[PDB]
């Protein structure tokens with residue numbers, strides 16, 4: 001049967017890819033609802049935030065990290081949560097870092113350029129820079145590393161790749177990829193893992209950025 | 216011996232209380248460094264962010280959630296990480312929700328009123344409101360609940376109480392506590408748990424808020 005219901009937006013959302021991916025890998029079928037702010041969604045997330053999740057259980061969850069972790073843990077033989085307590089903590093670290101120091105700031109960089117939140121290039125430039133100095137941490141970390149954590153694919157690879165994909169959809173052109181080769185190489189690798197590619201549209205990179213200022 | 220080193224600010228910092236508390240409960244001694252941005256701190260957190268942690272191991276960690284979880288997990292008999300996979304996920308949820316939907320917004324409410332980041336009352340009012348509608352989720356959730364997760368104290372109680380304490384230091388006067396009785400009652404309860412009170416200054420609540428606008 002269906003293991004539960006996941007409320008999200010249409011397509012390949014930054015905070016949802018990794019959740020779909022580990023569900024299909026662990027053999028848990030999800031019903032996907034792509035219409036936010038319905039009574040059943042707000043029953044989980046009173047604020048109407050995506051992603052939100054309800055088990056067939058009807059066990060309720062919000063926060064993308066919690067949903068990803070709960071799904072992943074269903075498989076007591078999983079390989080994706082590290083070898084030992086150290087590596088588990090590293091996975092928590094990178095998930096939390098990508099969710100707060102990259103996605104949040106990149107969103108402040110992006111929304112003004114789409115019209116959503118009010119616009120100001122001096123403010124938009126501030127966030128582009130802060131976003132980039134956080135990504136720089138990852139660029140340098142991945143020098144001579146293949147995976148974020150240990151020697152095989154983990155939930156952090158899938159979750160954080162999914163997060164950063166926002167950057168590859170809008171800002172990260174060939175030029176950017178030239179200055180950020182390790183992140184580019186790692187991202188491109190995660191996106192070609194079967195577990196991840198199974199639940200996403202076809203991989204594709206920008207030539208020119210779709211965005212600079214002003215709009 | 217010392218289990219490791221924790222870099223933080225002086226006193227009862229929103230993202231550190233819970234880390235000190237579970238360390239002293241699990242019998243792990245920490246060296247506490249209260250001077251940020253030293254070479255050994257930036258060796259962990261290149262961005263100079265607090266909290267950061269280095270084991271005697273010299274296992275390195277940043278992100279308060281990851282540090283709290285790593286310390287807590289050292290005690291394979293711990294009671295603080297829930298009964299089963301459902302409750303573990305609930306703890307992740309509340310930790311992540313408090314860290315992003317409350318502390319982050321409350322910080323945007325606070326900094327302009329202290330001079331740090333530029334000031335604007337229309338913007339400061341926006342964040343006060345968003346902060347409060349996230350706290351409202353917790354107020355309503357705690358109606359007829361004692362603990363955030365299950366029937367006993369958990370890491371989420373300690374971590375999230377520690378987070379929200381920022382609100383009690385600056386904005387949450389007797390008036391506020393009247394409109395938010397469940398959060399007030401729960402917070403006051405966590406702050407009197409020995410594990411938590413052991414590593415904090417003496418509990419104390421505001422009468423009038425220390426802050427409104429303008430400054």
Ligand SMILES: N[C@@H](CCC(=O)N[C@@H](CS)C(=O)NCC(=O)O)C(=O)O
Nearest residue numbers: 047048049050051063064065099315
């Ligand atoms: N702290 C949440 C953030 C979730 C979030 O903010 N989602 C956005 C979409 S990416 C949303 O649903 N916004 C609707 C709203 O904020 O009202 C998490 O980590 O899961």
Ligand SMILES: N[C@@H](CCC(=O)N[C@@H](CS)C(=O)NCC(=O)O)C(=O)O
Nearest residue numbers: 100262263264265266278279280314
């Ligand atoms: N995502 C981090 C946030 C840590 C953070 O931003 N800490 C603040 C103090 S509360 C800091 O150190 N700021 C210094 C800076 O940003 O340069 C976490 O959850 O641990």
